[PDB]
């Protein structure tokens, strides 16, 4: 049907906002939810492409969440969460967007991508077009935040981020 | 109708006209940036600022018109698969040029802050490096009552570059809000 | 110098006679002070170049007044001397619009007022600028509960202020 993903997106969006981005803490106000995506992670291969025959025991169902601090729209955080049996979510790891250094596309797997903060993280989405939507959301959010800079882009179609060759090489942090 | 289609093509031709018009303006702005960062005489320095001030306003006007003209073509394509894609192709080309302008003012900003730090270590021989970094950064800064020295005329050029940094960042703030305006799929 | 005190005196009584004397339906405003300025036709918002042709300079006047039923409603006027030998007001601001007052460091006669837009004018000398700005800011302090506009490149001792008293009295 190709439109169930949009149905579960809004469902997860309300779930994420209800438990993690609406109530105060202990206590700054909650961050502002921006977007999210469902990712898959290989437990014994978290930083590289897993082998094609990795049994389902190694796979994890996680989510990546992008949010900004409530008093500063230029401090974007990258969160990582999992679904509790109760139905809500629990944030496990939070990165600062300034830590983003490299974003790499997997040329072989239409769902896999690599984010590089202090370490390398290999993740893959459920469908090929969910990788495109989220990465375009993340790169756009970075250019908008950091004065029009870009992390090192590898194997990406620069036209997806409204860039070409001479404008990427002019805003790349390297 | 058929006559109702050639008017949409006039809209597309008018947008593409103002897109290449907007691209030549941005490239003209970048040329002024490369020239203003070199040691040029005060004679044609303000002649480059005058052309730059005229180009920045021409960009602001073309951005507003392209924002309206493209969004006008989008709602015309709400019920036509081809008229929607043509207006979408003009939207993607517009956003690409806003990204070029944002990057261009970004490079000129950091190369103007470094150019201002070299102009600030002389008027303030101390401070360096921890305190000269926060002097150029963050309006307002140390320009207030640094007037112990009433060579006497060059003491205000650091304020000319510092205000230009503010005018640049406000422009990028405008380009960022314009970038998010076009990303909204307006419906009617 | 002597004639200067007589120049602004002939302008004062002429401005009152032409624009602040007889009611035109409400009674007119009460004159306060004025200053002769120079406005560049093509560069009214920034410093013009020295090679700006004299066909771009305009002889205007900044007039301060207030409505007779309220001495806290100061208005700023831009008058024009014409070939008729008469004064005519063609621009009016409210004192509350005044946001930033800047002094040109290179040009001893230049000053910037930022109402809705930015306006760069030049007085006939450096001393006439000090008198008008000292009168304008003092009038602003007395009107808006001791607040001052955003002052740039002004020796705050002229307004009996210093660094600590300015940050607390500025409107930003």
Numbering used by the authors:
A (entry chain B): 74 to 99, 102 to 249
B (entry chain A): 33 to 182, 190 to 227
C (entry chain C): 75 to 99, 103 to 249
Wording from the paper:
Most syntaxin proteins contain an N-terminal region that autonomously folds into a three-helix bundle (the ‘Habc domain') that interacts intramolecularly with their SNARE motif to generate a ‘closed' conformation, which, in many cases, blocks its assembly into the SNARE complex345678910. The rate-limiting step is the interaction between Sso and Sec9, which is hindered by the auto-inhibition of Sso. Here we report that the exocyst subunit Sec3 directly interacts with Sso1/2, and promotes the initial assembly of the Sso-Sec9 t-SNARE complex and stimulates membrane fusion.
We have obtained the crystal structure of the Sec3–Sso2 complex under two different crystallization conditions, both of which demonstrate that the binding of Sec3 leads to conformational changes on Sso that is crucial for the relief of its auto-inhibition. The interface between Sec3N and Sso2 is ∼700 Å2, which is mediated primarily by 13 hydrogen bonds and 10 salt bridges. The seven main interface residues on Sec3 consist of K149, Q219, E222, H224, Y237, R241 and R245, which together describe a horseshoe-like shape on a relatively flat surface of the Sec3 PH domain. These residues provide a platform to make extensive contacts with Hc of Sso2, and some contacts with the SNARE motif of Sso2. In the Sso2-Sec3 crystal structure, the N terminus of the H3 domain bends approximately 22° away from its original position, and is tilted towards the Ha domain. The crystal structure suggests that Sec3 interaction causes the bending of the SNARE motif, which then led to the disruption of the hydrophobic interactions in the core of Sso2 involving HL2. Both the bending of the SNARE motif N-terminus and the relaxation of HL2 of Sso2 described above are found in all four copies of the Sec3/Sso2 complex present in the two different crystal forms.
